[PDB]
Design a protein around this ligand. Structure first.
Ligand SMILES: O=C(NC[C@H]1C[C@@H](NC(=O)[C@@H]2C[C@H](F)CN2)CN1C(=O)C1CC1)c1ccc(C#Cc2ccc(CN3CCOCC3)cc2)cc1Cl
Ligand SMILES: [Zn+2]
Length: 297
């Protein structure tokens, strides 16, 4: 039977917030059965805890933000991506500040920290949301879709009118392709012109080539270049996997993005939750006959 997983050991990590430019201390802790992923602002008295759930998403412009009163946690989607890919159900994310550290721009540092610590099976069935019906949202030229699928799969397409865009489409069946190998190293990215402006408005204060792909009109300015021919669309998939995890249960089904982002990914989540005709919660008495598979712990 497919069981809930938490961390075996606690993980301590250090970084900077992409927007805040603030140094932040990160502690990942095991958690009991049926906790979910809970973000916890330990710099406050009293300490403030926001479950990583679609109900707790704030104004979706720069990144995925969790909110509870006037306390926020900025840029959760990369860490949540990492935890999704390794199948982590239960964990406490402690932060000494408002923003999750950016690390290298990818999920890879987070995935390493998690597997280093190790994972622990817990005595309870894992709960899965299975897409039963197509559910689709559009706004202008953007679109984001759930389609039933005996497994877990994400496709994405982007279209920037810009010399640097290379492959702008990709699809990954995560039951036959490794999240760790193929998606987790995909780095966030930013246009020279936007970054010059946004910096001027006290935004992206922690950005650098050390944590972002920087791009002028013509080329990646990063000296050692890209990790993947298709890094940009691969990062969109990585962000999508994070936002999907705000459902609070692992997904059996497929996600398709067309120029989508946090805002419309969040509309799709809300529209899916709202239409109980479109999904069901299932468990599995036998892994050998389940449509998705997990690594050994
Ligand atoms: O938000 C950013 N990019 C959004 C990109 C990535 C995708 N979103 C994601 O990945 C989501 C959203 C979040 F990004 C995380 N997850 C979607 N997307 C788009 O579609 C873009 C709109 C086209 C971003 C990235 C890097 C910097 C930056 C920076 C930077 C880099 C270098 C320097 C140069 N300095 C030189 C001196 O040393 C310090 C650095 C300064 C700032 C600033 C920003 Cl504002
Ligand atoms: Zn991202």
């Amino acid at each position: 039977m497919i069981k809930q997983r938490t961390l075996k050991n606690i993980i301590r990590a250090t970084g900077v917030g992409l927007h805040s430019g603030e140094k932040v201390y990160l502690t990942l802790k095991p958690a009991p059965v049926d906790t979910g992923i809970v973000f916890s602002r330990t710099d406050l008295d009293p300490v403030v805890e926001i479950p990583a759930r679609a109900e707790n998403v704030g104004e979706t412009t720069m990144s995925t933000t969790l909110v509870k009163g006037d306390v926020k946690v900025d840029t959760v989607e990369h860490l949540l991506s990492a935890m999704a890919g390794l199948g982590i159900d239960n964990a406490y994310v402690e932060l000494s500040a408002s923003e999750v550290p950016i690390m290298d721009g990818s999920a890879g540092p987070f995935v390493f920290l998690i597997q280093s610590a190790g994972l622990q099976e817990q005595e309870a069935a894992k709960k899965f949301i299975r897409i039963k019906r197509e559910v689709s949202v559009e706004e202008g030229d953007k679109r984001a879709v759930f389609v039933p699928f005996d497994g877990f799969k994400v496709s994405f397409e982007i279209d920037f009118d810009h010399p640097v865009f290379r492959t702008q489409q990709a699809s990954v069946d995560f039951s036959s392709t490794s999240f760790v190998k193929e998606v987790s190293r995909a780095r966030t990215f930013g246009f020279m012109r936007d970054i010059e402006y946004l910096r001027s408005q006290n935004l992206a204060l922690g950005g650098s080539v050390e944590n972002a792909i920087v791009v002028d009109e013509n080329r990646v300015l990063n000296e050692d270049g890209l990790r993947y021919e298709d890094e940009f669309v691969k990062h969109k998939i990585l962000d999508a996997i994070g936002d999907l995890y705000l459902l609070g249960n692992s997904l059996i089904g497929e996600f398709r993005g067309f120029k989508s982002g946090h805002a419309l990914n969040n509309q799709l989540l809300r529209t899916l939750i709202a239409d109980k005709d479109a999904w069901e919660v299932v468990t599995f008495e036998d892994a050998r006959t389940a449509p998705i598979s997990y690594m050994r712990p």
